[PDB]
Structures are given as C-alpha cells and as structure tokens.
Write a protein that binds this ligand. Structure first.
Ligand SMILES: *[C@@H]1O[C@H](CO)[C@@H](O[C@@H]2O[C@H](CO)[C@@H](O[C@@H]3O[C@H](CO)[C@@H](O)[C@H](O[C@H]4O[C@H](CO)[C@@H](O)[C@H](O)[C@@H]4O)[C@@H]3O)[C@H](O)[C@H]2NC(C)=O)[C@H](O)[C@H]1NC(C)=O
Ligand SMILES: *[C@@H]1O[C@H](CO)[C@@H](O[C@@H]2O[C@H](CO)[C@@H](O[C@@H]3O[C@H](CO)[C@@H](O)[C@H](O[C@H]4O[C@H](CO)[C@@H](O)[C@H](O)[C@@H]4O)[C@@H]3O)[C@H](O)[C@H]2NC(C)=O)[C@H](O)[C@H]1NC(C)=O
Ligand SMILES: *[C@@H]1O[C@H](CO)[C@@H](O[C@@H]2O[C@H](CO)[C@@H](O)[C@H](O)[C@H]2NC(C)=O)[C@H](O)[C@H]1NC(C)=O
Ligand SMILES: *[C@@H]1O[C@H](CO)[C@@H](O[C@@H]2O[C@H](CO)[C@@H](O)[C@H](O)[C@H]2NC(C)=O)[C@H](O)[C@H]1NC(C)=O
Ligand SMILES: *[C@@H]1O[C@H](CO)[C@@H](O[C@@H]2O[C@H](CO)[C@@H](O)[C@H](O)[C@H]2NC(C)=O)[C@H](O)[C@H]1NC(C)=O
Ligand SMILES: *[C@@H]1O[C@H](CO)[C@@H](O[C@@H]2O[C@H](CO)[C@@H](O)[C@H](O)[C@H]2NC(C)=O)[C@H](O)[C@H]1NC(C)=O
Ligand SMILES: *[C@@H]1O[C@H](CO)[C@@H](O[C@@H]2O[C@H](CO)[C@@H](O)[C@H](O)[C@H]2NC(C)=O)[C@H](O)[C@H]1NC(C)=O
Ligand SMILES: *[C@@H]1O[C@H](CO)[C@@H](O[C@@H]2O[C@H](CO)[C@@H](O)[C@H](O)[C@H]2NC(C)=O)[C@H](O)[C@H]1NC(C)=O
Ligand SMILES: CCCCCCC[C@H](NC(=O)[C@H](CC(=O)O)NC(C)=O)C(=O)O
Ligand SMILES: CCCCCCC[C@H](NC(=O)[C@H](CC(=O)O)NC(C)=O)C(=O)O
Ligand SMILES: *[C@@H]1O[C@H](CO)[C@@H](O)[C@H](O)[C@H]1NC(C)=O
Ligand SMILES: *[C@@H]1O[C@H](CO)[C@@H](O)[C@H](O)[C@H]1NC(C)=O
Ligand SMILES: *[C@@H]1O[C@H](CO)[C@@H](O)[C@H](O)[C@H]1NC(C)=O
Ligand SMILES: *[C@@H]1O[C@H](CO)[C@@H](O)[C@H](O)[C@H]1NC(C)=O
Ligand SMILES: *[C@@H]1O[C@H](CO)[C@@H](O)[C@H](O)[C@H]1NC(C)=O
Ligand SMILES: *[C@@H]1O[C@H](CO)[C@@H](O)[C@H](O)[C@H]1NC(C)=O
Ligand SMILES: [Ca+2]
Ligand SMILES: [Ca+2]
Ligand SMILES: [Cl-]
Ligand SMILES: [Cl-]
Ligand SMILES: [Zn+2]
Ligand SMILES: [Zn+2]
Ligand SMILES: [Zn+2]
Ligand SMILES: [Zn+2]
Lengths: 696, 696
C-alpha cells in the first residue's frame, strides 16, 4: 500500500543526520556564492529524488553586510578621545573551524552607519513596558542617550523601534547569562550554553510583513521599480550592534545614576544593573562610542521550488517550506529544519517512483534570505499571490526542527487542531519514560493546554518565520511544529547559542539529539500533516475548532475593555455585535459539519464545493484594507503583536485600539476607534461564518 | 426542450410594456415609503414567478433631500439686496401628473447648505481641459466666483470637483439646448426634447467607488460604526444646484468680461457666452446668490435579492442586477431596465416550473439608491465580498434598456466579446430595413468598431452604474447592453429628458419604443448572456480576446508617453516590460485555448479546474493595493476615468501618471512614478497570464 504509514516508515533518522552534516560544513549567508551553490545542490537532489519540476526563483532584494575592511565595534572613550576599551571584532571560532573563511562577524543587519558617542541608559529588555517604567515612573529621559538592552522576551526589531521612539541615538544589544546561560550546563564546546564571547546576530528591521524594503507589494524581479533608500520600508534610523556578555560586563560595570527599579531588571552579571544615565563619579567623563560601517546592497537571492503534481486536484497546493540561508553554519537554524524537509522530499519521491501521486499538488520550498526579513518567501508569495489565494490549501513551515529536547511545540490555525491531535495519536513518542506511548500522550502530559482536560497546548501564529506572508497577508491555513525546551519565560528568547557561530552540527549531534530521534519525530509530524492535507478526500480542517477559539478570544478582548467600565458607559462601547457574530459562526459551523459528514459521497462537486468552503474559510478572515497602518497584515483574528513580532495577538485591531488607552489625550476619539474595530471584527466573523452557509 | 431558444421565446414585448407601466405611475425615490412598497411588490412577484428564495437586504446609508419647507433657488440680487429674478421652485409637471404628490424638486444630491453670493464665471462643460483653458490661456481666476457650467460630456461630480479645485464658491449646472435639444424634434409632451423648464437632477458625489460615504469598506448594517460627516467620503464642499435653460438664459444674458475663446464654448442660447467674471457695465453691481438648504440624512434602503439555485454548480453565481430607485417616475431610468429584468425572471421561472434549473446559480438583484452613488449594490457587495470574489462568475447590469432607438450599445470585458458576437448573430434585428437579418448584422453596420472589418463597436467599462463594484473593486467579469442613439458627441451627456420629471411611461410608449421591440431585443441580449453564462458547460469567456485588447492598450499608452521623447531618454523610461508581459499573455492564452478545446471532456475536474481559470482570469487583474489614492478602484487594466466617471480608461495608473506631466514641478519624481506604474502594469499582466498556465 501507498498510504501515510508507507510515507512515514520511509523517513530515516540516519538520512536526516547525513543531510544536516552536509548542510552545515560552511556558512550559507544569504546573497553569498556558497548559498547559491547550496541552492543548486538542493535543486539537483530534489530532481534526483523524483519531483516533477524543480526550479530556482530569484529576486534582487536589499541585504546588509559589514564592511570587510572597516569592522564594526564599540568603545569606551575617555575625555582625551582615547578608546580605552573595545568590543570584539569576531567570536572565537569553535574547535576545528578556526580556519573557516567567510564567517560574517556579529552585526545587526540593516543598521545604518554612524559613530554616535554619549552616555548609556540600561533599558532592561527594551520592551514597551520597560520604556513606560523608565519614562513614566522613573522619569528617566532616553533622548540623545545610547541605550543598552538585553536580548530576550521580544523580537529585537521591536526593541530598536521602542528605543528610536524614546529618542535614543544608538542601541547596544547583548546576551545576559540570566537569559542565555542555563544553570549547571557547560559553555560550548563542552555543553550547549553561550560563552562570554558568543554573540547573537539578527536583523533589526520593522517591515510589518512587507518583504524586500524596496518593493512592497510586488516581486523584486528584473524590471522592478525600487524605492529610493530614503523611502524604504522598515529601516532603523539609529546605529545598532550586538555584543556578548564578557563585553557587556565591561560596559555595564561603571553604570551610575538610578538603581534598577526592582529585581526583574537585574540580570546575572556581577554588576549593579544601574539604569543610568552615564557612569559613576570617577568615570563620569567617559562616554560610549559606536562605530558602525555596514552597508545595504541590492543582492540576488534564490528560492528552490519543487513541484509534485496532484493526481486528482493538481490545482490545489499544499506547501512545505523552510529557509536555507543561515547567519553562519546554521546547525540548528535553519539546517535542522532543511534536513527534515530534504528527507520528506526523498520519502515522497520514493512513493512517486513506485507510481503513487498525492491527490493534491505538493510544493516544496527552500527559501532564501529569511534571516534578512523573510525576503525569499515574501517576494515569491508576492509574485504568485493570485495562484496562492485561489489555490492554496495550506502552508506548513519547516525552520529549525529542535530548540530543545523536552516535548513537542505546535503553533497553527484552529483549522488544523484536529489534524494535529489525530496525527500525534498515531505517532510514537521519542521521549524517555514514554516508550510504547503515543506522541500525543507525552506532549499532552508535558505541555497541557490552559483551558482543557487531557488536551495539549497549541500556540497562535504571529511572525518571525516564513509562514508570515501565507497566513497573515494571504489567509492560507498555516502551521508549524518543532521539538522545544521546558523554559516558559525564555519562550521568545531563543536557545542559548541562537544565531551564534557556535550553532554547529556538533552542537546538535553532541548535545541536542544524538540519535536524531527528535528530528525524526518532527519529520513525521510535518510530513504527516502534509500527507493528510495533500491526500485526504475531504480537507482535514474542522471549522468547529475555530468557533471555540473565537469565543475564547472574544471573552478575552471584552475582559481587557472591561478594565475601563466608566469609559464603556460614557461612549456606549458594546461588544454585543462581536458575541452575536461568534454565536452565529458556532451555529453555522455546526450545521456545515453535519452536512460534511452526511453529504452524498459519490458527488465530487458537492465534495469540492465543500472542500472549497473549507479552503476559503481561513481566507475569509482577511480584510483587503489590512490592519491600521499595517496594510500587509490582513488577518482580522491574528496578527503579529505590535510589541513583539514573535508573538501572535488575537483580535489585534481591537487589542491595539485598547492598548494604553487611558493615556490617550482624546478619549472620545480613542473609544470611537475601539468601537470601529469591534464593528470590523464582528463583520469579519459573520462574513466568514456565511461562507459556510449553504451556497444557494 | 429547455434550451436557450425556449427561454428567449418566452420573453414578450407586451409583458415588458405592462411592467413598465406598473413601475412608473408614482415616484420611487430612494429611501421613501413608495420605493419600499415597490421593493415588497417585486419580492412577492419574483417569488410567484418561481425563484427559490427572494429576500430584502437592507442598509442604512447617507442620502440627501431638499427641505420641503425651505426650497432651493438661485437669485440675481441687486445692490440693495433685492432679489430681482428667481429660478423655478419645480418643473412644470407633465399632462395628467400635475396632481401627483411627492415629486422631488430639482436639486443636486449631497450639496452642502449655503447662501454664497458673487460674480459668475462661465466654464463651458467644467471639464479638466476647460479649466486649463480658463486658467492657463485666458488667465481667468475662478477663486471666490460662482461658476456656471453646462451639463454634458462628463459626469457632473467631476465638474464640481474641478470647480472646487479651481477655487469656486458655488456651482450652477444647467442644460443647454445645444446638448439637450435635438434639431427638428418637439419638446415634451409633443416630442422627446427637453423643455426650457426641464431640469436634470443628479448626485454630485466623488466617491471613487466607496459606496455609502459613512462606511467605506464595510456594509452599513445595524451595528455599523459610521464616520462623522466631516470625515465622510466624497462630499462636495461648495453649494451646487441644477436649472433649466429658460432660467439659465436669465443668468447668462448679462454676462460680461472676456468673450468665449472659440465656438466650442458657445451653446445654442441667444446670449454671448461671455466667460466673465461678472456682468456688463449697466448690471456690474448685481450678483448671483444661491440658496441651498438640502440635508443629508441616514436612511434605510432595500435591495431585493432573488436566487435560482444551480443544479450542478450552485456555488457559482451569475448575477443580473439593476436599480429600482428613480429621481421621479423613472420612465427610462431605471424602469425600462427593471421591466426587462422582471420579464427575464418570469421567463426563467417558467422553465423552472417545468423542472429545469440552470447549471450555475443565478442571482437577480433590484438595487436601491443607485441614484445616490450606487449605494445599494456597493453595500451588498461589501457585505458579500468573500462569496463574490470566490464564486462570482459574471455580472450583467440592467439599468435603462433604451437611450435611443438607433442601434445596440454594448460595454463589457474582453472576456465577453465572443459571447456577445455569437449571441447577437442568433437574434433577430428589430431595426427598420433589417427585417430577416441578425442583430449582429444591423449592429455592425450601424456601429462599426474602429479597428476591425465587419466587427461591431464594444466600449470599455468605467463607472456611473451598478457594475462598478463588481468589476472595478472585485474583478468579476461584467457587461451591459442597451439600445442607443446615433449622437456620438452626446455619448456621455444623456438623452434630453434624462433625470427630469418628463421621463415617463408616455415618453417611452409614444416616442422611444411604441411596440416594445427594442426592449424585447435588449431582454434577449441581457437574458441570453445570463443564460449562456449560467448554463454553458465551459464558461463562455475567450481569454484570447483579452490578449488582443491588451496589445492595443499597450500601444496606446506607449504613444501617449512618446509625446515626451526627451524625458523618456533622460529618465530611461522603457515600456519593454509591458510589451513582454502582453506577448507572454498572448502566447499563454493561445496555449490555454488549445487545452480548453482539446481536454478530456469526460473529466469534470479538468473542466472545473479550467472553468476556475476562466472565472479567476478577470480577478487576476485586481491589485489588492488599489490605484493611487483610490483604494476601491483595483482593476489595473480598466478604471473609471479620473476626469469622467462615465468613461472607462485603459492602464489608468500609467495614464494618470502621464497626464499633464509637462506641468509637474519635479520631472524626476513624475517620470519615476510613470516607471513605477509601468512596472505594476507589466507585473499584473504577467501574473494574470500565469493563472492560465498549466497549474502544476
Ligand atoms: C447573527 O444572526 C442573526 C440571524 O439569525 C442576525 O439577526 C439579524 O439581526 C439584525 C440586527 O439585529 C435584524 O435586524 C432587524 O431587521 C428588521 C427587518 O427584518 C428591522 O426591522 C430591524 O430594524 C428596526 O429595529 C432596529 C433595532 O431596534 C432599529 O435600529 C431600526 O431603526 C428599526 O426600527 C432590524 O434591522 C435582522 O432581522 C436579523 N435577521 C434575522 C433574525 O434573521 C444577526 O445580525 C447576526 N449577527 C451578526 C453580527 O451579523
Ligand atoms: C515573458 O516570459 C519570458 C519567459 O519566456 C520571461 O523571460 C524571463 O526574462 C527574465 C528577465 O529578462 C530572465 O532573467 C534572466 O534570468 C537569468 C537566469 O535564468 C539571469 O542570469 C539573468 O540575470 C542576468 O542578466 C540581467 C540582464 O542583463 C542582469 O540584470 C543581471 O544582473 C544578471 O547578470 C536574468 O535575470 C529569465 O531567465 C527569463 N525566463 C525564461 C527565458 O524562461 C519574461 O520575463 C516574461 N516577461 C515578463 C514581463 O515577466
Ligand atoms: C553534500 O552532498 C552533495 C551531494 O552528494 C555533495 O555534492 C556532490 O559532490 C560530488 C563530489 O564532489 C560531485 O561529484 C557531485 O556532483 C555533487 N552533487 C551535487 C552537488 O548534487 C557535496 O559534496 C556535499 N557537501 C559536503 C560538504 O559534504
Ligand atoms: C581600540 O581600537 C582603536 C582602533 O583600532 C585603537 O585606537 C587606534 O590606535 C592606533 C595605534 O595607536 C592609532 O594610531 C589610531 O589613531 C587609533 N584609532 C582611533 C582612536 O580611532 C585603540 O587603541 C584600541 N583600544 C584598545 C584598548 O585596544
Ligand atoms: C480526527 O479523528 C476523529 C475520530 O476518528 C474524526 O472524527 C470522526 O469522523 C468520522 C468521519 O466523519 C465520523 O464518522 C465520526 O463520528 C467522528 N468522530 C468523532 C467526532 O468523535 C475526525 O474527523 C478526525 N479529524 C480530522 C480528520 O480532521
Ligand atoms: C402593479 O402591479 C402589482 C401586481 O399586480 C399590483 O399590486 C397588486 O394590487 C392588487 C390590488 O390592489 C392586490 O390585491 C395585490 O395584492 C397586489 N399585489 C402585489 C403587491 O404583489 C399594483 O397594484 C400595480 N400598481 C399599479 C400602479 O398599477
Ligand atoms: C424671489 O424670492 C424671494 C423669496 O421669496 C422674494 O423676496 C421676498 O419677498 C417678500 C415679499 O415682499 C419679502 O417680505 C421677503 O423679505 C423677501 N425675501 C428675501 C429677500 O429673501 C423676491 O421678491 C422674489 N423675487 C421675484 C422677482 O419674484
Ligand atoms: C462563438 O462561436 C464560435 C463558432 O462556433 C465558437 O468557436 C468554435 O468553438 C468550437 C468548440 O470549441 C470549436 O470546435 C471551433 O473550432 C470554434 N470555431 C472557431 C474559433 O471558428 C466559439 O467558441 C464561440 N464562443 C463562445 C462560446 O464564447
Ligand atoms: C519578524 C522578523 C522576521 C525576519 C527574521 C526572522 C528571524 N527568525 C528566527 O530567527 C527564527 C525565530 C523562530 O521562529 O523561532 N528562528 C528559528 C530557530 O526558527 C529572526 O528572528 O531574526
Ligand atoms: C459615478 C456616479 C454614480 C452614482 C450615480 C449614477 C447615476 N447614473 C446614471 O444616471 C446612468 C448613467 C449611465 O450608465 O448611462 N443612467 C442610466 C440611464 O443608465 C448618475 O450618473 O447620476
Ligand atoms: C569599506 O571601508 C572603507 C572605509 O570607508 C571604504 O574604502 C570602502 O568603500 C567601504 N566599502 C563599502 C562602503 O562598501
Ligand atoms: C529629553 O531631553 C531633551 C533635552 O535635550 C528634550 O528636548 C526632551 O524634550 C526631553 N524629554 C523629556 C520627556 O523630558
Ligand atoms: C536533553 O535532555 C536532558 C534530560 O532532560 C537534559 O539533561 C539536557 O539538558 C537536554 N539537552 C538540551 C540541549 O536541552
Ligand atoms: C427645514 O427648514 C426650516 C428652516 O431652517 C427648519 O425649521 C427645519 O429644521 C428644516 N428641516 C431640516 C433641516 O431637516
Ligand atoms: C485668485 O484670486 C485670489 C484673490 O482673492 C488669490 O488669493 C488667488 O491666489 C488667485 N489665484 C490666481 C491663480 O491668480
Ligand atoms: C426613433 O427613430 C426614428 C427614425 O430614425 C427617429 O426619427 C426618431 O427620432 C427616433 N426616436 C427617438 C426617441 O430617438
Ligand atoms: Ca517585494
Ligand atoms: Ca459601506
Ligand atoms: Cl518552524
Ligand atoms: Cl445598463
Ligand atoms: Zn530560521
Ligand atoms: Zn534565524
Ligand atoms: Zn439609472
Ligand atoms: Zn440615473
């Protein structure tokens, strides 16, 4: 038989290991020759594996690189203009790689050039709430200061946006051991912790889903008209540079001014964590000086796109995509995902060689330039948006397969909840103590959902990865799955060696997954989801699961508003329309589910009419006018949080209209906008409900 | 047999006559009780006729009405403040209707209130080119003046926009006999010409496709959040009022200042057509004073929506829609169309009663408030936009069936050209001298296409009627057909009694179509188009016809740009990408047509996959970012002209970027924007082409 079990059984941990080794011996930075050569290798291999067509889709997009002959660094400068301390020019390379060329030194991609000098203010995580605390409670003014912030909690681009709007002239980002050094584990190469010379790379753009900063809306093809740099989307206006904790220690140790407001502002270094501004008495005349000389450059990038044509519905696409570009070796990010995609393609190809084809078309993607703002996936989706919004069934992401070895993590649309539950009940748990038990059993035990008995946690989708354009712009049902850690307060912080030179094959093989069993389990989940989406006669989406969550999100947004009962009375702010819409959605989804179970099965038009209702249900949550000042975030139920791109927010338009509303100067206008957002959300939920009604 | 011939043969001229009489005995102004009662009658009748469901869809939208106890008028005022001449308070009613109540007097809907007094400037048709002539050539300054303009040539809302931006404080619109009095024909009631007391009503909004001015983007339902009036969309900022030619004569006869620049500025009245400003010496101290007291009021409107469920593809909609609201009796506009829709529904219902159903679902619509800005169609399309863009096959409009008795007029998407040619070859010509000949033969003889031998003229779609939201916002293939006059320079001016109290049943029965043969022919064309769209196995769209027109439009826009060869050299302005896209579209459409003719006919999935490619081809020309500053006009190939809503423009984004470009202060920026629009158009044409490629 060619069934899901045949597909799953063909996947091998040993192949995933071999591929991961193959993908991680040299750097594959976006826009470099080494990453083009890897694209060509993957293209050739996917052809050999059996795909019907495998093409490169290239674009010319804005990238950012340090200047090789004018390196980035930070100094402490004395009154004479002597630089008495300098931060490192590179991370000490790991054992056996000290002679590898073309390791890009740590930098913040898309930082502008400059050499700002001034006094430091320490801003904790540079979160919205941290800047509120500084400014409103502590009366500390960031204007004209260099801010030093610890990485963690939220996306670094939000930190830099928050610093900019506070008036900062520069941002120094550093990794505090509190957030990146797990107790009782050795630093790399002797364990998986971050050494004091390690540094987290990463872009600091605020693109809000636009893709290439020069061509918002349209693919960056050969005849593209480009914005001038001054009109580009998302570029930071102040210099930014990341450092490790040995260097941070030298910068923080002299800090004066005000004490930290409380212990949530103190990291683990042996410094006071004084907020500043500036240094203590003896060193009051010293300043900090940045030297940033990186350049932005339009550069060719290459996606690999493989097609396995459907036998019955070739005009319906199930997409498995993940990126290929890395900051350095990409041992976890992204090659632990790319190796899993490679083995999934090989397995599907084995079935294809035996005469099988999936019911629907499967597209496989190796995206480029994800590290520079999801550029490859976004430009391709812009090029192909008409095909995707009329034919796109689902997108399954495949960045890193592991960020820990504790349990499964799944973030996806409610439409995929039942698919994931059913699939995980059929897979073996790889966990110690759960031999002979299902993955569903181990996952549910280790990661219980807050609301339900005997149910696992599934998170919402925001941004930070290549599902963003498919889900948030185009409204295609999307999902992701990986193995994760236990550490809840570190959820959005990354694993310790994230985006460092230390992220290697050895890191994974020695410390995370020696048997490649967690990688194999993740391959089974991602591959199984793709298999069911591409082969099930009826699409495996349960609209009733959306009805359940919409009521939870309505209760939640109502509770936020109800912090302000007087204003709700004054401005007649009613959530009645939203609850009515959710009630109607619940009722109509229940009836649709009855018809889906009961319709005449011999009738392919009723089936496909029904399959189209399922497919276009996620699409119905798209508003073609987008969210306020964010035209490329169009999903009305989910958006990336306006305070943290990594986090999904529910009913974001209402949430943002309510956020900090007590501080708005014109409460009538602010509450008017809350009421407008309630109307848009109620309307969108009712309109989505009506797509599931009988069609005529 | 239940075939198209059975449907067509059931249509009767006598029924259309009876319905027209029934719909035109009393006024049916939008938002009034009489129009709600007609909606209920139509709902009941469509049910009796056999439709599966017939519902009212209501909305609460901004409408505009004169004040019944404070009438609108214009005066000539002397230096003492004596009003020595006043314009009429109503049109003399036609014979037999002098005791009909609730005839709304002539007014410009959505005029603000005011009583501006000042000196007149005569602005010809108030076209863009007329204001260029005044300001740039004649050095006449409209600022603070009351402008008097003759109706004709372009939509009156464009006249008022042009007057506003020229600085005018008021606009008087009048009907010149040059434009509304055909030589050798008697005035109503003794012929079809406009009497000197007749007045053309009409709204003067500039909504750019938004619908209700208070709820752009979203249906004006019971929980809608409404813009405040100050933020409303499209409202004029200066008072406006229409008058007839007896009253215009009294206003123009004293005009002084500069002579008309040439004979194209002179109408037919026995006045000098002096441009002004102000009156000649003896009356130099007299002014003109407007008195406008109309009010804008949120008012309930009602669409009737009838469904005839498809037997095979009930989730595919073919829509026949036209409006029901009239300014007064609506003898031509819209009841000559509504009567034809009524007879089409009755005929389809006769087949349904015998056991027939169409293959696809047919929706029939009686729209409200079209005269106030296409409000009914637009709010309904906003409510149902997700259903329409995933399921909408085609929209056929059905406003007035006649505006003359000379020949057929068809405006439609290229996708419908072959359908219209084939259908008209099978219908009988109603014309004198063409008995026994086809409608195609008479039409092609009377209205030859400029480019082709033995082909009829078909025009482009702009706005001005209820197809606008379906075609320009949502990208659903649309068409319209009616009988028309010979008068080419009057094409956008209306027939003489347009929007006057004289537009009655008697006008039609005595002067336009005594035998109702032209109405029957129009019923055959509109009904036949609906029949073929709802019943043909393969959708009757020919993508190759789009390829032909796209090359014509590319040649045309290139020729406009080539008026400026130096600038094209300087700014490197290349149309190569657009021609390449059009070439690719031509090639891919040809191959798709081969597959369509040759595909396995026993295969319903390939058929429907192919039918979906046909259906989504018009959809592919939509840009989700819309046209510049016009978010609700989203079709990249067509938009309503920015100078005349009635006219369609091709490649509007490039056309507007080039328009008057020699006058722009920053040529680098202006030519940059031309290049941007070329890129967007080339990309959109290539993306539409690619929807017709093999799907995988
Ligand atoms: C959830 O689905 C239900 C359908 O099961 C749907 O109920 C609809 O609610 C609307 C708005 O509440 C109802 O609107 C009424 O329609 C009648 C005509 O049928 C009008 O006469 C009513 O207007 C009068 O009363 C208003 C309220 O006091 C006044 O403001 C107004 O000026 C009039 O005096 C009113 O428009 C509609 O009939 C039902 N439809 C049904 C029951 O089938 C509900 O809207 C859905 N929820 C959402 C968010 O869409
Ligand atoms: C109409 O359809 C045709 C396909 O039949 C399609 O042709 C494509 O044109 C593009 C752009 O002209 C070609 O792009 C080239 O791709 C190769 C790799 O295949 C690149 O090496 C080329 O880049 C080099 O040369 C450029 C131009 O001098 C330089 O600017 C650049 O820096 C590089 O040095 C270039 O990108 C593409 O290969 C073809 N595809 C084919 C022939 O299959 C055409 O684009 C379509 N029209 C539209 C409007 O889409
Ligand atoms: C990664 O694996 C690929 C695929 O086997 C290797 O590329 C092949 O290398 C051999 C020997 O140089 C060539 O003959 C083949 O043509 C290559 N095949 C391709 C590119 O498809 C590559 O050497 C491996 N890389 C590493 C670092 O081990
Ligand atoms: C930090 O780096 C800077 C730049 O390399 C050093 O300053 C330079 O030192 C050389 C050699 O004496 C001078 O000729 C240059 O003029 C200096 N460049 C400057 C000030 O921009 C500095 O000495 C280093 N500091 C430490 C502690 O190593
Ligand atoms: C997940 O599995 C459950 C249990 O098998 C599926 O629910 C059953 O679906 C079948 C077929 O429609 C019904 O006959 C049963 O009554 C359902 N049992 C229930 C709800 O307990 C469910 O459809 C699967 N979900 C998918 C495939 O998305
Ligand atoms: C237009 O035609 C309709 C339909 O025949 C007429 O409405 C009917 O009038 C009779 C007598 O008053 C009633 O018994 C019916 O119930 C009505 N039917 C409806 C509304 O569906 C209406 O009288 C005609 N109007 C004119 C001006 O002739
Ligand atoms: C034009 O209409 C106005 C308004 O009705 C007339 O002016 C009014 O005349 C009455 C009666 O004498 C006065 O009491 C009012 O004060 C006037 N209203 C004004 C000036 O606003 C005017 O006489 C009419 N002119 C003609 C030629 O008929
Ligand atoms: C209009 O009529 C023409 C002539 O009948 C149709 O063109 C024919 O279509 C059939 C069926 O595919 C082909 O076998 C013939 O070769 C075509 N003849 C031609 C192109 O001369 C055409 O399809 C009709 N257009 C519609 C229905 O939109
Ligand atoms: C919004 C920002 C998108 C552009 C870079 C995205 C890049 N993403 C990543 O680094 C992701 C984050 C995640 O999904 O866990 N890392 C991996 C291990 O998945 C970044 O954060 O740096
Ligand atoms: C853009 C303006 C849309 C709102 C009013 C539209 C109204 N339309 C009409 O009056 C139409 C114009 C036409 O399509 O021939 N009249 C009829 C006879 O079709 C108007 O012009 O007054
Ligand atoms: C890198 O550094 C030096 C110093 O400005 C300069 O010569 C060179 O142009 C720079 N490279 C760039 C800006 O790409
Ligand atoms: C911060 O400091 C600068 C002084 O240079 C001042 O212009 C700015 O308004 C200050 N902001 C606050 C909140 O005090
Ligand atoms: C793998 O799991 C073990 C057992 O819980 C733990 O001690 C170790 O730290 C884990 N490794 C990583 C990288 O999380
Ligand atoms: C109509 O006219 C009079 C004069 O202002 C006034 O009493 C009444 O309010 C007006 N009606 C309106 C504005 O609807
Ligand atoms: C028209 O007249 C007014 C004088 O009130 C002036 O402000 C305006 O600039 C003038 N425009 C031109 C083009 O002369
Ligand atoms: C109808 O046609 C005749 C013959 O051409 C013409 O004399 C008459 O003016 C027409 N009527 C109208 C309303 O156009
Ligand atoms: Ca782009
Ligand atoms: Ca609206
Ligand atoms: Cl992922
Ligand atoms: Cl029409
Ligand atoms: Zn990644
Ligand atoms: Zn990453
Ligand atoms: Zn009309
Ligand atoms: Zn009209």
């Amino acid at each position: 038989k060619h069934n899901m079990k045949a597909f799953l059984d063909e996947l091998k941990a040993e192949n995933i290991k071999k591929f991961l080794y193959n993908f991680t011996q040299i750097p594959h930075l976006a826009g470099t020759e080494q990453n083009f050569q890897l694209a060509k290798q993957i293209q050739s291999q996917w052809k050999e594996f059996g795909l019907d067509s495998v093409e490169l889709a290239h674009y010319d997009v804005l990238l950012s690189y340090p200047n090789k002959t004018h390196p980035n660094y930070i100094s402490i400068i004395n009154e004479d203009g002597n630089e008495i301390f300098n931060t490192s020019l590179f991370e000490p390379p790991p054992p056996g790689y000290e002679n590898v060329s073309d390791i890009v030194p740590p930098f913040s991609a898309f930082s502008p050039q400059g050499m700002p000098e001034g006094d430091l203010v320490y801003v904790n995580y540079a979160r919205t709430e941290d800047f509120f605390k500084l400014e409103r409670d502590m009366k500390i003014n960031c204007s004209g200061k260099i801010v030093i912030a610890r990485y963690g909690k939220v996306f670094r681009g939000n930190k830099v946006k928050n610093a900019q709007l506070a008036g900062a002239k520069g941002v120094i980002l550093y990794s505090d051991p509190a957030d990146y050094f797990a107790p009782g584990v050795k630093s790399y190469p002797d364990g998986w912790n971050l050494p004091g010379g390690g540094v987290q790379r990463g872009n600091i753009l605020n693109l809000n889903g636009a893709g290439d900063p020069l061509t918002p809306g349209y693919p960056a093809n050969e005849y593209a008209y480009r914005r001038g740099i001054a009109e580009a989307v998302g570029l930071p206006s102040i210099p930014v540079h990341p450092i490790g904790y040995y260097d941070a220690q030298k910068l923080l140790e002299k800090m004066g001014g005000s004490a930290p407001p409380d212990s949530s502002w103190r990291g683990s270094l042996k410094v006071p964590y004084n907020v500043g501004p500036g240094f203590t008495g003896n060193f009051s005349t010293q300043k900090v000086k940045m030297h940033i000389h990186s350049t932005n450059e339009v550069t060719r990038i290459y996606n690999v796109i493989g097609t396995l044509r459907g036998a019955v519905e070739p005009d319906r696409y199930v997409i498995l995509g993940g990126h290929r570009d890395s900051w350095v070796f990409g041992g976890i990010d992204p090659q632990s995902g790319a190796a899993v995609v490679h083995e999934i393609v090989r397995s599907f190809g084995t079935l294809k060689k035996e005469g099988w084809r999936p019911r629907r078309t499967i597209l496989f993607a190796s995206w480029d330039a994800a590290e520079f703002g999801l550029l490859g996936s976004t430009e391709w989706a812009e090029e192909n948006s008409r095909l995707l919004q009329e034919r796109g069934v689902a997108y399954i992401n495949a960045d890193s397969s592991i960020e820990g070895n504790y349990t499964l993590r799944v973030d996806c649309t409610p439409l995929m909840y039942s698919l994931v539950h059913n699939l995980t009940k059929e897979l073996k748990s790889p966990d110690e103590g759960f031999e002979g038990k299902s993955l569903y059993e181990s996952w549910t035990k280790k990661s219980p959902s807050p609301e339900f008995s005997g149910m696992p946690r599934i998170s919402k989708l925001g941004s930070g990865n290549d599902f963003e354009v498919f889900f948030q712009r185009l409204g295609i049902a999307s999902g992701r799955a990986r193995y994760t850690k236990n550490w809840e307060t570190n959820k959005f912080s990354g694993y310790p060696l994230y985006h460092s030179v230390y992220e290697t094959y050895e890191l994974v093989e020695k410390f995370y997954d020696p048997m490649f069993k967690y990688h194999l389990t993740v391959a089974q989940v991602r591959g199984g989801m793709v298999f069911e989406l591409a082969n099930s006669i009826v699409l495996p989406f349960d609209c009733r699961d959306y009805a359940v969550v919409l009521r939870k999100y309505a209760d939640k947004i109502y509770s936020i508003s109800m912090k302000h009962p007087q204003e709700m009375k004054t401005y007649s702010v009613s959530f009645d329309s939203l609850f009515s819409a959710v009630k109607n959605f619940t009722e109509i989804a229940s009836k649709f589910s009855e018809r889906l179970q009961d319709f005449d099965k011999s009738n392919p038009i009723v089936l496909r009419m029904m399959n189209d209702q399922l497919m276009f249900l996620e699409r119905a949550f798209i508003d073609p006018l987008g969210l306020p000042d964010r035209p490329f975030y169009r999903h009305v139920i989910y958006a990336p949080s306006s305070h943290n791109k990594y986090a999904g927010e529910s009913f974001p338009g209402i949430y943002d209209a309510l956020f900090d509303i007590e501080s708005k100067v014109d409460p009538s206008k602010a509450w008017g906008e809350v009421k407008r957002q309630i109307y848009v959300a109620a309307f969108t939920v009712q309109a989505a409900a009506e797509t599931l009604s009988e069609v005529a």
